[PDB]
Amino acid sequence: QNLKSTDRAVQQMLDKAKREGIQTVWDRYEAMKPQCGFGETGLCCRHCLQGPCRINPFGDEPKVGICGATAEVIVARGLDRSIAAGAAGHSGHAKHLAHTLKKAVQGKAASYMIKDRTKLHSIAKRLGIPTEGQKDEDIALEVAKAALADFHEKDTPVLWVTTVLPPSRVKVLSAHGLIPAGIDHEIAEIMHRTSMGCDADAQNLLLGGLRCSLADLAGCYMGTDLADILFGTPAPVVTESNLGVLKADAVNVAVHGHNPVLSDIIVSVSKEMENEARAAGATGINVVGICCTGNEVLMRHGIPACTHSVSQEMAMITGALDAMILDYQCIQPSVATIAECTGTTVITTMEMSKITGATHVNFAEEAAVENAKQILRLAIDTFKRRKGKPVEIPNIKTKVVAGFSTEAIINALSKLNANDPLKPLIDNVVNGNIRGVCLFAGCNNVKVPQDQNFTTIARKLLKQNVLVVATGCGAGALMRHGFMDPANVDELCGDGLKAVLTAIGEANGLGGPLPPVLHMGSCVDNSRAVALVAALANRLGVDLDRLPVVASAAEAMHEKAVAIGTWAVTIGLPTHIGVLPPITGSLPVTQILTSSVKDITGGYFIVELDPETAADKLLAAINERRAGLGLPW
């Protein structure tokens, strides 16, 4: 089972699934092999009813699609549609929070409110919205209107791009026509241009993709901004992760998906019903996180994270998971059928994301507390039904220090230099105690033994004094393996990095270092890493393609991850991907994405499936940036 997952709690659950005859994601993968090589390489098109068209990677015919579409065009069109689908997810999440904020301040949903007034005014100021002499609710109405306006064409481009990157970066992107005109506008234009008999030039297509990836970045940033206004900006928190956070004697409720609009409320209401839970024979309600909505409540409230991504079914296999409360994205629909075998109640809540066989509760922000109580009562009923059933919760968990929003990082650094908080970080980049910065992002993928690439790459980077930050299921992988426990700094970190983490930790009244890896939050919170990097760029007076900063989607899966990697390249970062995107069927497309894009944006993809080799490539990219700044390396 260590060939399927490097997580020992997952391995124990895979044994239980096997002996109980419950099919898992790994079993469904094995049944899919050998997978189609045309699709793996990108050399398949279904964009019209003349298809499917395929192109042999090598050999004889077919060499071209029926309409004349070349391998270059077919690969670039497929990739662009993946970018657009990722942008649609992140920006659908942001749009939902924009509507929630509007309703809150219009008096339509009093379970929601402005919790971070300071963040609200800073966002308004960034967008140019006047705050002097205005009520908070009017400022917020204007912020929510601005958010919604970025989805369509107007007299300004997308402000959640142009106001969040350095002017010099905006200017480079504008010169190549890459600034998005509106988020949903770009998604639709990608769908148009990639339909049959439209765009058929690989460079043109891929420039469209870069622009659409910036619409994804805007959605991410808008989502983080709005969630912080509504739910609070994260600050350092301590909690736990892995399946041992489940408790046999409690009602275990997992929040799963991405958008915390419902699950932030579940967290609050769950505490009101501790007595209702005690009356049903439980110790209380134990809310735990899966995937990114789990990250959201971990970062803001310290809710422990049960599991992530590819291993999500395993939480059910314990027999102790009484409810799994779903919104959207990254939820394996297998959970609805597994729940018949495990005695979990799987509940959907969003109109556009239902799963046959799950119970649907039509969550409305206007009724949020009511809906939360209905859902929690279903989970209490389910707890009662398992009275006397044995469960098998692996007694495996890690300690997690998290909550490192960019504001939190700046505040922690300010204890070393109050009026120039980024300077201590920069000083230690220059002196070599911090070699550079690597962001780990994205999913697990069944093709890769779970967490193997994240942990292998991270270990090598940390020994080489790289400051490692993480989000999403990259953060999940690292937290489940101990990389968010400061007790592991001595074992994992190079001496320079250890010195820096220790100095910041001690200056923040911890008597110990910051953790080895800094958890910056959910997938939309990749935007927080952008904020940090853009602030460093501003403080140094350079663009992001000169900073020693890289990204790694070391085990990517979702279309969202393809969008994030593409905008990481578009904003100027060397960006590793550790699973093969469907591009290898076209050498010209591969060469654009891994080489000639450097001449447009300064970033580039590093496609490398071997994690030891990927780490060496990422260190080489960091060290080239250091050399370009005249620094030793």
**Residue 33 gets which letter from DSSP?**
P
Binding positions for ligand [S], 287-326, rule CB under 6 A: 291-292
Q: Which of ligand [S], a copy of itself, ligand FES, none does 419 bind, CB closer than 5 to 8 A by kind?
A: none
According to the binding rule CB under 8 A, does residue 89 interact with a copy of itself?
A: yes
The interface partner of residue 309, options being ligand FES, Fe ion, ligand SF4, none and the CB cut-off 5 to 8 Å by kind, is: Fe ion
Is residue 523 near ligand [S] by the rule CB under 6 A? yes
Measured CA to CA, the distance from residue 588 to residue 596 in angstroms comes to 10
Of the candidate residues 4, 14, 24, 38, the single one contacting ligand FES (CB under 6 A): 38
What tokens appear for 607 in the block?
A: 């496609």
End-to-end CA distance of the chain: 40
User: Which listed residue (17, 45, 305, 438) binds ligand SF4 by CB under 6 A?
Assistant: 45
Under 8 Å CB-to-CB from 198, ≥6 apart: which residues?
192
Which partner in ligand SF4, a copy of itself, ligand [S], none is near 447 (CB below 5 to 8 A by kind)? Answer: a copy of itself
Per the CB < 8 A criterion, the answer to whether 327 and 258 are in contact is: yes
Out of 10, 53, 375, 479, the residue judged to bind ligand SF4 by CB under 6 A: 53
Side-chain-facing half-sphere of 41: CA atoms under 13 Å: 16
Q: Cα separations (Å) of 581 from 42, 137, 166, 521, 576?
A: 8, 44, 30, 25, 11
* Beta carbon of residue 557, minimum distance to ligand [S] (angstroms, whole number): 8
Q: Does 523 bind Fe ion (CB under 5 A)?
A: yes
How far is it, in rounded angstroms, from Cα 25 to Cα 4? 10
Q: Is 520 in the site for Fe ion (CB under 5 A)?
A: no
Indicate which of ligand [S], a copy of itself, Fe ion, none lies near residue 609 (CB less than 5 to 8 Å, by partner kind).
none
Residue 291 marked in a binding site: no
Q: How far is the CB of 593 from ligand SF4 (least distance, A)?
A: 21
Instruction: Tell me, rounded to whole angstroms, the distance of Cα 143 from its chain centroid.
Output: 24
What is the chain's Cα-based Rg? 24
Q: Are 518 and 493 in contact (CB under 8 A)?
A: no
Nearer to a copy of itself, 32 or 110 (CB): 32
Q: Whole-angstrom Cα distance, residue 427 to residue 266?
A: 43
493 marked as binding residue: no
Tell me which of ligand SF4, Fe ion, ligand FES, none is bound by residue 54, counting a contact when its beta carbon lies within the kind-specific cut-off of 5 to 8 angstroms: ligand FES
Angle, CA of 366, 370 and 376, to the nearest 5°: 135
* 45 known member of a binding site: yes
HSE, side-chain direction, 13 A CA sphere, residue 324 = 32
Footprint (CB under 6 A) of ligand SF4, residues 64-93: 65-67, 69, 74
String of b and e for 314-332 (b: at least 16 CB within 10 Å)? Answer: bbbbbbbbbbbbbbbbbbb
Among 330, 422, 503, 530, binds Fe ion (CB under 5 A): 330
x/- mask, a copy of itself, residues 439-468, rule CB under 8 A, reads ------xxx---------------------
Residue 212 annotated as binding site: no
Q: Is 360 annotated as a binding residue?
A: no
Helices (H), 464-525: 472-480, 489-492, 495-507
Residue 222 CB, shortest distance to ligand SF4, in Å, is: 26
Beta-bridge partner residues of 440: 470, 552
- Asked if residue 558 binds Fe ion (CB under 5 A), the reply is yes
In our burial notation (b when 16+ CB lie closer than 10 A, e otherwise), range 466-480 reads bbbbbbbbbbbbbbb
Q: Which is nearer to ligand FES, 62 or 281 (CB)?
A: 62
| Integer Cα distance of 98 and 91 in angstroms | 10
Nearest-approach distance from CB 52 to ligand FES, in angstroms: 4
Please say which residue, 71 or 330, places its beta carbon nearer to ligand [S]: 330
Binding mask 432-461 for ligand [S] (x = CB under 6 A): ----------xx------------------
- Please state the closest distance from residue 206 (CB atom) to a copy of itself, in A: 12
Residues that bind ligand FES (CB under 6 A): 36, 38-39, 44, 46, 52, 54
Residues that bind Fe ion (CB under 5 A): 291-292, 309, 330, 443, 472-473, 523, 558
